[PDB]
Paper text:
One of these proteins, Acidic Mammalian Chitinase (AMCase), is an enzyme known for its ability to function under acidic conditions in the stomach but is also active in tissues with more neutral pHs, such as the lung. AMCase is a member of the glycosyl hydrolase family 18 (GH18), the members of which hydrolyze sugar linkages through a conserved two-step mechanism where the glycosidic oxygen is protonated by an acidic residue and a nucleophile adds into the anomeric carbon leading to elimination of the hydrolyzed product. We found that mAMCase has maximum activity at pH 2.0 with a secondary local maximum at pH 6.5, pointing to a bimodal distribution of activity across pH. Mutations Lys78Gln, Asp82Gly, and Lys160Gln result in the loss of surface-stabilizing salt bridges in hAMCase and may contribute to its reduced activity at more acidic pH. It is likely that the dual pH optima of mAMCase is intrinsic to the catalytic mechanism, where Glu140 can be protonated directly from solution (at low pH) or through proton shuttling across the catalytic triad (at neutral pH).
We also directly observed conformational and chemical features of mAMCase between pH 4.74 to 5.60 by solving X-ray crystal structures of mAMCase in complex with oligomeric GlcNAcn across this range. Across these different datasets we observed complex ligand density in the active site of mAMCase. Across these different datasets, we observed ligand density for different combinations of occupancy over the −4 to +2 sugar-binding subsites. While modeling chito-oligomers into strong electron density, we observed strong positive difference density between sugar-binding subsites near the C2 N-acetyl and the C6’ alcohol moieties. Using the non-crystallographic symmetry (NCS) “ghost” feature in Coot, we were then able to observe that the positive difference density between ligand subsites in one chain could be explained by the dominant ligand pose observed in another associated crystallographic chain, suggesting the presence of a low-occupancy binding events. This observation led to the discovery that GlcNAcn occupies intermediate subsites, which we label n+0.5, continuing to follow the nomenclature established by Davies et al., in addition to canonical sugar-binding subsites. During ligand refinement, we observed density for both the α- and β−1,4-linked GlcNAc2 anomers in the active site. This unexpected configurational heterogeneity, which is observable because of the high resolution of our datasets (1.30 – 1.95 A), likely formed as a result of equilibration between the two anomers through an oxocarbenium close-ion-pair intermediate. By modeling GlcNAc2 as sequentially overlapping ligands in alternative conformations, we are able to visualize each step in the proposed catalytic cycle of mAMCase. When the −1 subsite is at least 50% occupied, Asp138 prefers the active conformation (up towards Glu140).
Residue numbers in the entry: 22 to 397
Write the structure that this text describes.
Amino acid sequence: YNLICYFTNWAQYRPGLGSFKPDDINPCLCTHLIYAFAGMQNNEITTIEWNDVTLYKAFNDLKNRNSKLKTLLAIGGWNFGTAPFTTMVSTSQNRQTFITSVIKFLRQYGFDGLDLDWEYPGSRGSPPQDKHLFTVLVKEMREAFEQEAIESNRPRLMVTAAVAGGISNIQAGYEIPELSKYLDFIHVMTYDLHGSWEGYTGENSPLYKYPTETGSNAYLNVDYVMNYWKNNGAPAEKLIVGFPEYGHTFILRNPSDNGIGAPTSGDGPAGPYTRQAGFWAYYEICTFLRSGATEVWDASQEVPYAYKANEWLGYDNIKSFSVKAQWLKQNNFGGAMIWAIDLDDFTGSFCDQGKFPLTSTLNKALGISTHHHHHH
Ligand SMILES: CC(=O)N[C@@H]1[C@@H](O)[C@H](O[C@@H]2O[C@H](CO)[C@@H](O)[C@H](O)[C@H]2NC(C)=O)[C@@H](CO)O[C@H]1O
Ligand SMILES: CC(=O)N[C@@H]1[C@@H](O)[C@H](O[C@@H]2O[C@H](CO)[C@@H](O)[C@H](O)[C@H]2NC(C)=O)[C@@H](CO)O[C@H]1O
Ligand SMILES: [Mg+2]
């Protein structure tokens, strides 16, 4: 199994003990590290932070303590939008400009591949032709990477993609059978499945549907999304399940109405380190739990929720990570990806569960480390 861990180049700006840079990563936890994000300018890949070149070196230097570790550079992300991708794929010339720039960039800075994070072809303003043009891009990139391996006499760069977990976006965006022939791995974003945007509480990454859910509400679970990809053309061994190391927050309209689906208002509270409404890192979650929040196991969906006064949190913990890791193994998927390692309790000092409690859970369940060949 693979354990793919995203690192974010803006975590460095978080205050106090929230600040996270590549040297804070345990090089042995994951099989692949993905650096989020590069940008694009004039159809060419580019850095975005003033110190990205320094961070790239620190990131790829982690391989000096793990001979099997591979790194990838992710381009795009949610906040990148779609227009630069639409322009870049619109012509063969723009695609070749981009592909050529990617090859030079990855080889110069020490990356083993590119993770395409266009959110999403065919949606959020991207026009319908982009569904097929995304496949064209990925095919041309895979073939260019194959040719560069021949020409440089090196193992070829990998091409992966982070892909939508919402069914409407999947249908509008991806020619799944053709894409799956060319991508090395498909990182399915099986999270952000519920949140304050809906106006009621729900879980961020439930494994299964809630018992009353029907129709399109019943798409909003890991099981359905992963099987949607599998049964529409993607091989299970290329499919990677998304695991969030954060939760979504809500304000209950009435503190006494605190189950799944209870009405909420506004965008949800922000945490002191991540400073974004509706979102708490796992280490921020532990601070909330320890202060007396009521904890509930959502048994049908295999995830926890918690609430205190009018604050409600849908999240993941060691138990839910364990259940979902068992599930992905028993369904023959290729492994797990985590968004993001800088949101785990990396110092071990917020949750009293050891360093990297969530990431370590997956490392153990997926057989990533050890193979010590004796009783443990
Ligand atoms: C691979 C992946 O998860 N890509 C998306 C991420 O971009 C997104 O994280 C958000 O990234 C923004 C840049 O696009 C940052 O500004 C923001 O702080 C960060 N976190 C958020 C929005 O909560 C993740 C989050 O689930 O999901 C994907 O959409
Ligand atoms: C299943 C599905 O498509 N859910 C959508 C959510 O992804 C989306 O939330 C946003 O997700 C982005 C992509 O990961 C994050 O970067 C972004 O922070 C997050 N927005 C908020 C407020 O948390 C929501 C809202 O746009 O829509 C759902 O339909
Ligand atoms: Mg068929």
